[PDB]
Amino acid sequence: ESFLYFAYGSNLLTERIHLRNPSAAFFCVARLQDFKLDFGNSQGKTSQTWHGGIATIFQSPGDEVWGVVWKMNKSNLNSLDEQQGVKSGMYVVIEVKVATQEGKEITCRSYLMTNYESAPPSPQYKKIICMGAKENGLPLEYQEKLKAIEPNDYTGKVSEEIEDIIKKG
Amino acid sequence: EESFLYFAYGSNLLTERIHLRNPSAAFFCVARLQDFKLDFGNSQGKTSQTWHGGIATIFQSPGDEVWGVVWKMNKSNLNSLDEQQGVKSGMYVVIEVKVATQEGKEITCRSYLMTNYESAPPSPQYKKIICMGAKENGLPLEYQEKLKAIEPNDYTGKVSEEIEDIIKK
């Protein structure tokens, strides 16, 4: 009655994933081998939540992506899908096999964009991602990679609830 | 359950082709994937040495559609099907899609698409197999016309004996 979800974008942060998925439970940190992290505008349209490119992954031998595996109730499958804009063509549901630090392979649900234009993330979206990576102890090398991502020059605001999270951090 | 449903849109449209490696696959129904578009390419920049041209993929595109065949397979078959699609070498990723039957019933299916490829026309042999499968398994006649309208590359070399025999009739 449960499934595992591999998050690599803003759902790295516990407080963020809990906004719409309060019952999500931390499972483990894991590595997705032979994928590269990118940021982009799905269907060439900028996210009005985040005001910059949002996270995606594509297959790239030799690259890697680190994330958090969350344990969720299967009753929340449709809700998670809705949040990711699956019907609107923003993301497609994928299945990935990820490696734990104990050398175990875990099968997870995740999401990626299939039609997008690359574009840098807003400062706020980058910050939330870095906050989640730190909170859940992703490898320091990968945290440094995230910190090195060049943001766009958006100087406006995102939602109050998101801005509050950034301030508390 | 003991079984899973698999949505084919490329050479696995043809019963004799899918049965080469998946002999227990059973026809389930014809179905439409809304808001995706069919394309052909060289995944990871590599030209298929089986087909000698671009192979089939799909990507999100509002207003477009892809018709295909839903196959019922045993869950014991999952790992094999993945291996066939070169998931571990980055050729395709596993997706979940929701498709509509010709009676408007929604079905949840496993499928595959490329995440990193260069667009390239299919070989005549690969096109032929796709068109044969579409006709054999009853895809809508207007979709069959779209498949027949695909411009192939100019590959007129040798293909595998198995492919050539299928094509011969």
Swiss-Prot record, chain A:
Disulfide bonds: none annotated. It catalyses: an alpha-(gamma-L-glutamyl)-L-amino acid = 5-oxo-L-proline + an L-alpha-amino acid. GO terms for cellular component: cytosol; extracellular exosome. Substrate binds at residues 5-10, 125. GO terms for molecular function: gamma-glutamylcyclotransferase activity; protein homodimerization activity. The modification Phosphoserine is found at residue 159. Induction: By geranylgeraniol. InterPro entries: G-Glutamylcylcotransferase, GGCT-like, GGCT-like_sf. One of its GO terms (biological process) is release of cytochrome c from mitochondria. The active site is at residue 84. Its EC number is 4.3.2.9. SUPFAM superfamilies: Gamma-glutamyl cyclotransferase-like. Keywords: Lyase, Phosphoprotein. Homodimer. Catalyzes the formation of 5-oxoproline from gamma-glutamyl dipeptides and may play a significant role in glutathione homeostasis. Induces release of cytochrome c from mitochondria with resultant induction of apoptosis. Belongs to the gamma-glutamylcyclotransferase family. This is Gamma-glutamylcyclotransferase. The gene is GGCT.
UniProtKB/Swiss-Prot annotation, chain B:
PANTHER family: GAMMA-GLUTAMYLCYCLOTRANSFERASE. Keywords: Lyase, Phosphoprotein. Gene3D superfamilies: Gamma-glutamyl cyclotransferase-like. InterPro entries: G-Glutamylcylcotransferase (IPR017939), GGCT-like (IPR013024), GGCT-like_sf (IPR036568). This is Gamma-glutamylcyclotransferase. Pfam families: AIG2_2. Its EC number is 4.3.2.9. Catalyzes the formation of 5-oxoproline from gamma-glutamyl dipeptides and may play a significant role in glutathione homeostasis. Induces release of cytochrome c from mitochondria with resultant induction of apoptosis. The modification Phosphoserine is found at residue 160. Belongs to the gamma-glutamylcyclotransferase family. Homodimer. It catalyses: an alpha-(gamma-L-glutamyl)-L-amino acid = 5-oxo-L-proline + an L-alpha-amino acid. GO terms for molecular function: gamma-glutamylcyclotransferase activity; protein homodimerization activity. CDD domains: GGCT_like (cd06661). Induction: By geranylgeraniol. GO terms for cellular component: cytosol; extracellular exosome. Changing residue 10 to A: Marked decrease in catalytic efficiency. It comes from Homo sapiens. GO terms for biological process: release of cytochrome c from mitochondria. Substrate binds at residues 6-11, 126.
